[PDB]
Design a protein around this ligand. Sequence first.
Ligand code: NI
Ligand code: NI
Lengths: 139, 139
Amino acid sequence: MKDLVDTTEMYLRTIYELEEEGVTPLRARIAERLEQSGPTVSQTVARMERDGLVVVASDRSLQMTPTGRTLATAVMRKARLAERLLTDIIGLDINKVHDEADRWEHVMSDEVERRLVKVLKDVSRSPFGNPIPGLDELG
Amino acid sequence: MKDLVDTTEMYLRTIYELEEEGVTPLRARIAERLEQSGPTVSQTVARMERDGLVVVASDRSLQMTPTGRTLATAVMRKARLAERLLTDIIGLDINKVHDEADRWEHVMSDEVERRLVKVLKDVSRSPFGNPIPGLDELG
Ligand code: NI
Ligand code: NI
């Protein structure tokens, strides 16, 4: 099992987050926050294209296809719902919540999410301040 | 990400479970319950030996080394604590709990487990009747 658990999903999560912070999505920036080499990033992104999940634009910025964006959104949703579960119910020290959720986000089923929406007091945003996306699509 | 999420841990979980049911651990039986080909199983087990996690005995039965057994035990502990969390708090339909936990068991940290022990009403056994092992070692 790779440290990122699901490589492709982590590249999409990265692109998503860069967008959230008004940062242009560049392969160069993915390598930086995921601590992966350039060729490695270049190869993965290349595969994501043939898979139809992202497009390397003329300016070389990364443009997620609608299907790429749907998957990325669901990964963010699972992560933030996990972060909420880990904080609100399990009581995991906040300093460990991000890394834990970073792994769980890749194995959480839509079904468990639905349950978390019903059990959690509120799913407006994650414990770190960001809005929990895709709630309406969840289903 | 492979469907087993963490292949090695699943082979150990399988060996553990076969032991729980008084079934001789054989590569042949791992292939059957994990739906993997014989050569694939033979190759994985071969690697687990060099890794010092298991020994292929003269009679060809699988004997987990103490280190192999410690990891297997922790995987069972994480799985059964996840099963307990999914049933007792999250309310995931019991018919989906085994598969969900089957994935979570590979990404749960010792830290979250400790929290689950404190939050769950009781961790004597999983929702499916089996004892939750390694609780004292958890730490
Ligand atoms: Ni992740
Ligand atoms: Ni598993």
